[PDB]
Write an enzyme that holds these catalytic residues in place. Structure first.
Site, PDB file in Angstrom:
ATOM      1  N   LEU A  36       0.841  -1.211   0.000  1.00 10.69           N
ATOM      2  CA  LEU A  36       0.000   0.000   0.000  1.00 10.69           C
ATOM      3  C   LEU A  36       0.875   1.261   0.000  1.00 10.69           C
ATOM      4  O   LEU A  36       1.967   1.191   0.499  1.00 10.69           O
ATOM      5  CB  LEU A  36      -0.883   0.044   1.230  1.00 10.69           C
ATOM      6  CG  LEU A  36      -1.868  -1.132   1.324  1.00 10.69           C
ATOM      7  CD1 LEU A  36      -2.824  -0.849   2.467  1.00 10.69           C
ATOM      8  CD2 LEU A  36      -2.685  -1.342   0.030  1.00 10.69           C
ATOM      9  N   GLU A  50      -7.819   1.106   9.634  1.00 11.13           N
ATOM     10  CA  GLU A  50      -8.269   0.881   8.241  1.00 11.13           C
ATOM     11  C   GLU A  50      -8.280  -0.631   7.890  1.00 11.13           C
ATOM     12  O   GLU A  50      -9.267  -1.102   7.302  1.00 11.13           O
ATOM     13  CB  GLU A  50      -7.414   1.668   7.238  1.00 11.13           C
ATOM     14  CG  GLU A  50      -8.252   2.185   6.029  1.00 11.13           C
ATOM     15  CD  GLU A  50      -8.628   1.095   5.040  1.00 11.13           C
ATOM     16  OE1 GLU A  50      -9.752   1.178   4.557  1.00 11.13           O
ATOM     17  OE2 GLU A  50      -7.775   0.230   4.800  1.00 11.13           O
TER      18      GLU A  50
HETATM   19  N1  LIG Z   1      -5.350   0.138  -1.540  1.00 13.00           N
HETATM   20  C1  LIG Z   1      -6.121  -0.982  -1.749  1.00 13.00           C
HETATM   21  O1  LIG Z   1      -7.296  -0.985  -1.448  1.00 13.00           O
HETATM   22  C2  LIG Z   1      -5.526  -2.143  -2.513  1.00 13.00           C
HETATM   23  C3  LIG Z   1      -4.200  -2.103  -2.920  1.00 13.00           C
HETATM   24  N2  LIG Z   1      -3.583  -3.110  -3.644  1.00 13.00           N
HETATM   25  C4  LIG Z   1      -2.196  -2.897  -4.066  1.00 13.00           C
HETATM   26  O2  LIG Z   1      -2.344  -2.869  -5.545  1.00 13.00           O
HETATM   27  C5  LIG Z   1      -1.218  -3.646  -6.081  1.00 13.00           C
HETATM   28  C6  LIG Z   1      -1.553  -4.961  -6.755  1.00 13.00           C
HETATM   29  O3  LIG Z   1      -2.514  -4.628  -7.658  1.00 13.00           O
HETATM   30  P1  LIG Z   1      -2.285  -4.768  -9.200  1.00 13.00           P
HETATM   31  O4  LIG Z   1      -0.870  -4.458  -9.584  1.00 13.00           O
HETATM   32  O5  LIG Z   1      -3.441  -4.066  -9.861  1.00 13.00           O
HETATM   33  O6  LIG Z   1      -2.479  -6.372  -9.478  1.00 13.00           O
HETATM   34  P2  LIG Z   1      -3.629  -7.560  -9.383  1.00 13.00           P
HETATM   35  O7  LIG Z   1      -3.801  -8.002  -7.952  1.00 13.00           O
HETATM   36  O8  LIG Z   1      -4.793  -7.076 -10.152  1.00 13.00           O
HETATM   37  O9  LIG Z   1      -2.858  -8.741 -10.141  1.00 13.00           O
HETATM   38  C7  LIG Z   1      -2.672  -8.681 -11.595  1.00 13.00           C
HETATM   39  C8  LIG Z   1      -2.445 -10.080 -12.099  1.00 13.00           C
HETATM   40  O10 LIG Z   1      -3.513 -10.970 -11.531  1.00 13.00           O
HETATM   41  C9  LIG Z   1      -4.173 -11.641 -12.584  1.00 13.00           C
HETATM   42  N3  LIG Z   1      -5.454 -10.952 -12.936  1.00 13.00           N
HETATM   43  C10 LIG Z   1      -5.922  -9.718 -12.633  1.00 13.00           C
HETATM   44  N4  LIG Z   1      -7.164  -9.603 -13.152  1.00 13.00           N
HETATM   45  C11 LIG Z   1      -7.472 -10.764 -13.731  1.00 13.00           C
HETATM   46  C12 LIG Z   1      -8.572 -11.260 -14.411  1.00 13.00           C
HETATM   47  N5  LIG Z   1      -9.647 -10.511 -14.595  1.00 13.00           N
HETATM   48  N6  LIG Z   1      -8.514 -12.511 -14.890  1.00 13.00           N
HETATM   49  C13 LIG Z   1      -7.440 -13.301 -14.730  1.00 13.00           C
HETATM   50  N7  LIG Z   1      -6.363 -12.839 -14.097  1.00 13.00           N
HETATM   51  C14 LIG Z   1      -6.378 -11.597 -13.612  1.00 13.00           C
HETATM   52  C15 LIG Z   1      -2.872 -11.638 -13.373  1.00 13.00           C
HETATM   53  O11 LIG Z   1      -2.086 -12.707 -13.261  1.00 13.00           O
HETATM   54  P3  LIG Z   1      -1.562 -13.674 -14.424  1.00 13.00           P
HETATM   55  O12 LIG Z   1      -0.401 -12.809 -15.067  1.00 13.00           O
HETATM   56  O13 LIG Z   1      -0.897 -14.802 -13.611  1.00 13.00           O
HETATM   57  O14 LIG Z   1      -2.625 -13.849 -15.445  1.00 13.00           O
HETATM   58  C16 LIG Z   1      -2.450 -10.277 -13.656  1.00 13.00           C
HETATM   59  O15 LIG Z   1      -1.053 -10.128 -13.968  1.00 13.00           O
HETATM   60  C17 LIG Z   1      -0.283  -3.940  -4.890  1.00 13.00           C
HETATM   61  O16 LIG Z   1       0.505  -2.760  -4.758  1.00 13.00           O
HETATM   62  C18 LIG Z   1      -1.229  -4.043  -3.698  1.00 13.00           C
HETATM   63  O17 LIG Z   1      -0.612  -3.637  -2.456  1.00 13.00           O
HETATM   64  C19 LIG Z   1      -4.310  -4.309  -4.052  1.00 13.00           C
HETATM   65  C20 LIG Z   1      -5.638  -4.404  -3.597  1.00 13.00           C
HETATM   66  C21 LIG Z   1      -6.227  -3.388  -2.807  1.00 13.00           C
HETATM   67  C1  LIG Z   2      -1.491  -5.466   1.533  1.00 17.44           C
HETATM   68  O1  LIG Z   2      -3.010  -5.656   1.293  1.00 17.44           O
HETATM   69  C2  LIG Z   2      -3.581  -6.339   2.346  1.00 17.44           C
HETATM   70  C3  LIG Z   2      -2.887  -6.566   3.526  1.00 17.44           C
HETATM   71  C4  LIG Z   2      -3.525  -7.252   4.552  1.00 17.44           C
HETATM   72  C5  LIG Z   2      -4.843  -7.683   4.423  1.00 17.44           C
HETATM   73  C6  LIG Z   2      -5.534  -7.457   3.251  1.00 17.44           C
HETATM   74  C7  LIG Z   2      -4.898  -6.781   2.208  1.00 17.44           C
HETATM   75  C8  LIG Z   2      -5.544  -6.542   0.998  1.00 17.44           C
HETATM   76  C9  LIG Z   2      -5.563  -7.665  -0.100  1.00 17.44           C
HETATM   77  C10 LIG Z   2      -6.336  -5.313   0.610  1.00 17.44           C
HETATM   78  C11 LIG Z   2      -6.683  -4.217   1.598  1.00 17.44           C
HETATM   79  C12 LIG Z   2      -5.991  -3.891   2.702  1.00 17.44           C
HETATM   80  O2  LIG Z   2      -6.618  -2.829   3.331  1.00 17.44           O
HETATM   81  C13 LIG Z   2      -7.666  -2.464   2.578  1.00 17.44           C
HETATM   82  N1  LIG Z   2      -8.537  -1.490   2.807  1.00 17.44           N
HETATM   83  C14 LIG Z   2      -9.545  -1.303   2.009  1.00 17.44           C
HETATM   84  N2  LIG Z   2     -10.378  -0.345   2.316  1.00 17.44           N
HETATM   85  N3  LIG Z   2      -9.678  -2.110   0.904  1.00 17.44           N
HETATM   86  C15 LIG Z   2      -8.840  -3.107   0.592  1.00 17.44           C
HETATM   87  N4  LIG Z   2      -9.130  -3.796  -0.553  1.00 17.44           N
HETATM   88  C16 LIG Z   2      -7.767  -3.334   1.465  1.00 17.44           C
END
Ligand SMILES: NC(=O)C1=CN([C@@H]2O[C@H](COP(=O)(O)OP(=O)(O)OC[C@H]3O[C@@H](n4cnc5c(N)ncnc54)[C@H](OP(=O)(O)O)[C@@H]3O)[C@@H](O)[C@H]2O)C=CC1
Ligand SMILES: COc1ccccc1/C(C)=C\c1coc2nc(N)nc(N)c12
Length: 186
Positions: free
Chosen positions: A22, A30
């Site tokens: 993040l 959060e």
């Molecule tokens: N602030 C928040 O709420 C959140 C933050 N994050 C952060 O975002 C980042 C990761 O997100 P991001 O880079 O977008 O990557 P994703 O988690 O979306 O992973 C992308 C990969 O997952 C597969 N994938 C994604 N969508 C599909 C689909 N529709 N069908 C099949 N495969 C799919 C792939 O793997 P393959 O190449 O093997 O096909 C593609 O390379 C990290 O930095 C994480 O910390 C993530 C979630 C929540």
């Molecule tokens: C490093 O990421 C994580 C770390 C620990 C647990 C869960 C997550 C993930 C996958 C995602 C999230 C962690 O905190 C979040 N807040 C909001 N509001 N939405 C989300 N999707 C996440």
């Protein structure tokens, strides 16, 4: 198959991730909100389903994998099996969403939650039917390399409040944030 929900936390510059983590320092309260929103089901015996991409799975600390008390499903177009600790793997969001309605998951699943990352969000938010977006508005800018799509205030509505969601500005570690819920019903 209960409701379809996205949950994300996002900086003022629309950032969600930075180098596989993040973009802001750890925000315990959060994480706690995330956990309580995704894990709570009002139906006894059921669990909620969390769908995520592969980088999102690997961003979770190993101690928190799989996410406890939820059925975890990972999206990937390449993996032959679910990653160590995961038990479901689908090649697409449609595939995953279909997999919920039976053969065996659909009497175990209550709510379905999309928990990231960018590509999965884009597709879910576009997905036709009833959708809610749970968005934590992290009320400042952070350096990021992964982003959340702008929400269309002509398709979605902003709800003034929502059960179990605090409606006032919160603050933690010197960072202010707002929990918002948006809803669409096309
Ligand atoms: N602030 C928040 O709420 C959140 C933050 N994050 C952060 O975002 C980042 C990761 O997100 P991001 O880079 O977008 O990557 P994703 O988690 O979306 O992973 C992308 C990969 O997952 C597969 N994938 C994604 N969508 C599909 C689909 N529709 N069908 C099949 N495969 C799919 C792939 O793997 P393959 O190449 O093997 O096909 C593609 O390379 C990290 O930095 C994480 O910390 C993530 C979630 C929540
Ligand atoms: C490093 O990421 C994580 C770390 C620990 C647990 C869960 C997550 C993930 C996958 C995602 C999230 C962690 O905190 C979040 N807040 C909001 N509001 N939405 C989300 N999707 C996440």
């Amino acid at each position: 198959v209960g409701s379809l929900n996205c949950i994300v936390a996002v900086s003022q510059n629309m950032g969600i991730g930075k180098n596989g983590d993040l973009p802001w320092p750890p925000l315990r309260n959060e994480f706690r909100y995330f956990q309580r929103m995704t894990t709570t089901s009002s139906v006894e015996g059921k669990q909620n389903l969390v769908i995520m991409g592969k980088k999102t799975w690997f961003s979770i600390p190993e101690k928190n994998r799989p996410l406890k008390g939820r059925i975890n499903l990972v999206l990937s177009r390449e993996l032959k099996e679910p990653p160590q600790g995961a038990h479901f793997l689908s090649r697409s969001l449609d595939d995953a969403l279909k997999l919920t309605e039976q053969p065996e998951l659909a009497n175990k699943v209550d709510m379905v939650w999309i928990v990231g990352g960018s590509s999965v969000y884009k597709e879910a938010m576009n997905h036709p039917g009833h959708l809610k977006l749970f968005v934590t508005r992290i009320m400042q800018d952070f350096e990021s390399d992964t982003f959340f799509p702008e929400i269309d205030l002509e398709k979605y509505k902003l709800l003034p409040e929502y059960p179990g969601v605090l409606s006032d500005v919160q603050e933690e570690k010197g960072i202010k944030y707002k929990f918002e819920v948006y809803e669409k019903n096309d």
